[PDB]
Structure 1
Amino acid sequence: ADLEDNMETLNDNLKVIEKADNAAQVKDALTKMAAAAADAWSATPPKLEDKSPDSPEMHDFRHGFWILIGQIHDALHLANCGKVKEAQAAAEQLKCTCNACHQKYR
């Protein structure tokens, strides 16, 4: 449940996908990432505890996970069609979104 637990999962599985050598292994990893992203979406980070749940910052915070999940879902779709390398390249790119939210809210 904890935001510091979803982030762990997110970081771990990224490593798993990088080392993967087949589609099934990538798919399995993308799925846990998807689930951790989904769960995180509903959280309040230490930096935004003082902000309106309805604030522009929390709509954006939640919107960053919306973007992530989307990109996880595209990566997953590549792995489901056997396209392993394309799906690992997509997972690699995920880090830019991770960073763009970390820069504003971590």
Structure 2
Amino acid sequence: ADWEDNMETLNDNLKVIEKADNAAQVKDALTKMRAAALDAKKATPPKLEDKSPASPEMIDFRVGFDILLWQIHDALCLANEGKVKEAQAAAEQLKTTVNAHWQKYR
């Protein structure tokens, strides 16, 4: 895959979380999002393909994926506590972050 496909996986699992019926489904979707966010952190997005891997721009990109990963980590804790609705609330902020990253790096 690639960065774009990782972003598509993030969006798909956000859609799954929105429609989820139980904590197991939210946990599964958030786990998939965690894996996808890491994989995207290892990629180079289209806008930064003219920048070096250790440029400040790419370092900041990887930190942005760290931010997304921490939002996922905390939402996953909230889901493992069984609070499905609050985990969906946190997934809303997840959606905001993912959209901003898509607009910034595509």
Task: Return the TM-score normalized by structure 2.
Answer: 0.92
> In structure 2, what is the Cα distance between the partners aligned to 1:102 and 1:8?
10
Kindly provide the CA deviation profile for residues 29-67 of structure 1, in whole angstroms up to 9, marking residues without a partner as x.
000000000111011112111112221110111111000
% same residue: 84
2:38 aligns with 38
Letter of the aligned partner of 2:13 in structure 1?
Answer: N
1:15 aligns with 15
> In structure 1, what is the Cα distance between the partners aligned to 2:16 and 2:48?
31
Q: How many residues align?
A: 106
Q: 1:100 to 1:4 in 2, by over 3 A?
A: closer
Letter of the aligned partner of 2:43 in structure 1?
Answer: A
Letter of the aligned partner of 1:26 in structure 2?
Answer: V
Letter of the aligned partner of 1:47 in structure 2?
Answer: K
2:75 aligns with 75
Q: Aligned-residue CA RMSD in angstroms? A: 1.2
1:54 aligns with 54
- 4+ residue segments displaced more than 6 Å: none
Instruction: List alignment gaps of at least 5 residues for structure 2.
Output: none
Instruction: List alignment gaps of at least 5 residues for structure 1.
Output: none
CA contact (8 A) 2:16 2:29 kept: yes
